[PDB]
Write a protein that binds this ligand. Structure first.
Ligand SMILES: Nc1ccn([C@H]2CC[C@@H](COP(=O)(O)OP(=O)(O)OP(=O)(O)O)O2)c(=O)n1
Ligand SMILES: [Ca+2]
Ligand SMILES: [Ca+2]
Ligand SMILES: [Ca+2]
Length: 342
DNA sequence: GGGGGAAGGACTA
DNA sequence: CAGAGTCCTTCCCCC
């Protein structure tokens, strides 16, 4: 099994560059303006010109302006990025029918039947890079290896505009000299939780008795890390299928007033249904982000598809159930639809 | 003692 | 200051 991972570089900021080359060289910060207070909002993405100084995704726009007051700030234009992505994703499609689109800027190729050593995998990946660049002026990063996880890791180390391979040899080394916190799927909450157990490297998992691991990080994850270090990660590249679509929005001011929230909830619904394509969902979940940034949600599943009018009706009941069963003020509200009729 | 569905939360990209 | 989607886990109904 020879996986070829592709990952566009700071996609949103780069797409803004391709559309406006004058931005090339200058730090670019694509952000989401919440509309609460002037420059309120968060940073969605930024090019390396800004990354170098600490301006990264997740930080407050204000903060970003205190670090790079002269950097260029652009509002996020998801729709554009999405179309550019689609075009690229189609290019990749021509290099293997076995392709898994993980996200708007990530794809996993299973070139096992496409190549034989790793020398061409590298070369193949080279063609993919010179292809995407030649057609969309977008630089990406390729990470080749024996499985999705390591492929990604390879890519993580080679970004930006790179391409790294991981010989079964290095796979062995990494399982020993790589901080388990650089391993896909292991986040701060599991990173520390692991450290407490003394595990700092992937192989350190092979020691600890099982039930102790699948006791503090759950069975599933426990295995995942094990099978990975024990060099047995299987997981094939299967075509991903969107299982849920939805939209959440930030209100101008925290409220607990049903009549003050409805309008935000409905706008979120209109957008979701639009994005729903022709998909008919049987389940709808109203999601709310509290004042303390807590996330609560009430949903429901029907024995039939959901009509926009029913979405409007059921979403309001669920929102009420939320306000009944909770006291905190709501900051962000939204909806999400799933279980699409096939 | 699990299958299946609801609500939480971890991580993601 | 703090802006989409998948999977895993827990608690509960039910066979
Ligand atoms: N707090 C955060 C963190 C990340 N993201 C988004 C930013 C784009 C996507 C992927 O992030 P990275 O892959 O880390 O960066 P990138 O811009 O996608 O490109 P690169 O992979 O080269 O860093 O996740 C986000 O919306 N909010
Ligand atoms: Ca990327
Ligand atoms: Ca990590
Ligand atoms: Ca990443």
């Amino acid at each position: 099994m020879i996986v070829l991972f592709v990952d566009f570089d700071y996609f949103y900021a780069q797409v803004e560059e391709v559309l406006n080359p004058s931005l090339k060289g200058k730090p670019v910060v694509v952000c989401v303006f919440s509309g609460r207070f002037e420059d309120s909002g968060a940073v969605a993405t930024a090019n390396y010109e800004a990354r170098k100084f600490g301006v990264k995704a997740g930080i407050p726009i204000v903060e970003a302006k205190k670090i790079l007051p002269n950097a260029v700030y652009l509002p996020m234009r998801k729709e554009v990025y999405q179309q550019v992505s689609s075009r690229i994703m189609n290019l990749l499609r021509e290099y293997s029918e076995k392709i898994e689109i993980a996200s708007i800027d990530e794809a996993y190729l299973d070139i096992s039947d496409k190549v034989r050593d790793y020398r061409e995998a590298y070369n193949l990946g080279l063609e993919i890079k010179n292809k995407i660049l030649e057609k969309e002026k977008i630089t990406v990063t390729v990470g080749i290896s024996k499985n999705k996880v390591f492929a990604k890791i390879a890519a993580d180390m080679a970004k930006p505009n790179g391409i790294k391979v991981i010989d079964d040899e290095e796979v062995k080394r990494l399982i020993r000299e790589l901080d388990i916190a650089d391993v896909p799927g292991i986040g701060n909450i599991t990173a520390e939780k692991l450290k407490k157990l003394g595990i700092n490297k992937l192989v350190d998992t092979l020691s600890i008795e099982f039930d102790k691991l699948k006791g503090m990080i759950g069975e599933a994850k426990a295995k995942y890390l094990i099978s990975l270090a024990r060099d047995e990660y299987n997981e094939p590249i299967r075509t991903r299928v969107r299982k849920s679509i939805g939209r959440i929005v930030t209100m101008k001011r925290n409220s607990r007033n049903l009549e003050e929230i409805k309008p935000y909830l409905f706008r979120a619904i209109e957008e979701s249904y639009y994005k729903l394509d022709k998909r008919i969902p049987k389940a709808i979940h109203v999601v709310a982000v509290t004042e303390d940034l807590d996330i609560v949600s009430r949903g429901r599943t029907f024995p039939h598809g959901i009509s926009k009018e029913t979405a409007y009706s059921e979403s309001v009941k669920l929102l009420q159930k939320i306000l009944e069963e909770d006291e905190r003020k709501i900051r962000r509200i939204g909806v999400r639809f799933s279980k699409f009729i096939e």
